[PDB]
Amino acid sequence: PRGSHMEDFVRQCFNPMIVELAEKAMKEYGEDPKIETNKFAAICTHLEVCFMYSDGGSKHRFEIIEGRDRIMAWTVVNSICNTTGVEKPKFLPDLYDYKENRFIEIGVTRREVHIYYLEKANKIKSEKTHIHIFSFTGEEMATKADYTLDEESRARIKTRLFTIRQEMASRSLWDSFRQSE
Numbered sequence: 001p002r003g004s005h006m007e008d009f010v011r012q013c014f015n016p017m018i019v020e021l022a023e024k025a026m027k028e029y030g031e032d033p034k035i036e037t038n039k040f041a042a043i044c045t046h047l048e049v050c051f052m053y054s055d056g057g058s059k060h061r062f063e064i065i066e067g068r069d070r071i072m073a074w075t076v077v078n079s080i081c082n083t084t085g086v087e088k089p090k091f092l093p094d095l096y097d098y099k100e101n102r103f104i105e106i107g108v109t110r111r112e113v114h115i116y117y118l119e120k121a122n123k124i125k126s127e128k129t130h131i132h133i134f135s136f137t138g139e140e141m142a143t144k145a146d147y148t149l150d151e152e153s154r155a156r157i158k159t160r161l162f163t164i165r166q167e168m169a170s171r172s173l174w175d176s177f178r179q180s181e
């Protein structure tokens with residue numbers, strides 16, 4: 001298969017630490033970034049979005065669950081649950097908001113904004129965990145219209161998503177990413 005050249009953009013566009021974290025996360029599940037480059041980009045973007053989400057809070061407002069070893073990412077959730085008495089989610093979340101004591105599941109969708117929620121709410125029947133979806137076009141959708149974060153932080157988020165979209169369109173690989181889900 002040799003190289004991919006889209007992974008080159010993925011490496012030149014994202015934080016080196018984010019790239020390494022996404023690479024190790026994909027390799028954990030028997031997937032190759034060198035071939036699944038659209039994946040690679042999707043997991044890198046999800047990682048970055050979760051990171052700006054955690055940064056847009058206060059100081060201890062968010063416990064980051066995504067970007068960890070599966071065993072440790074579960075250990076921290078078990079600790080959170082035995083701490084706050086919150087029922088453990090059936091599926092591993094993304095963040096945990098201490099301020100409002102809820103597991104936030106960050107969704108970075110590619111198709112319609114409604115479809116990602118229609119899938120995520122159906123996946124985790126645990127109605128306690130919160131669900132928040134961002135869009136590449138610049139839209140969003142949260143659970144019970146409770147968007148948790150501010151508005152300028154979320155706006156900076158969607159700005160970053162549209163910047164990544166424009167960068168992908170510059171090198172003419174945008175439809176290849178939109179048609180890979």
Ligand SMILES: O=C1NCCc2cccc(c2)OC/C=C\COc2cccc(c2)-c2nc1c(O)c(=O)[nH]2
Binds near residue numbers: 031066093106
């Ligand atoms: O928590 C998560 N965990 C998934 C961890 C992972 C990383 C790499 C490879 C994997 C598993 O195995 C491959 C089979 C399918 C997965 O591929 C995609 C592709 C695009 C987005 C996501 C997953 C996505 N993952 C999560 C989210 O929370 C989320 O919003 N989106």
Ligand SMILES: [Mn+2]
Binds near residue numbers: 066092093094
């Ligand atoms: Mn996740």
Ligand SMILES: [Mn+2]
Binds near residue numbers: 105106108
């Ligand atoms: Mn998620």
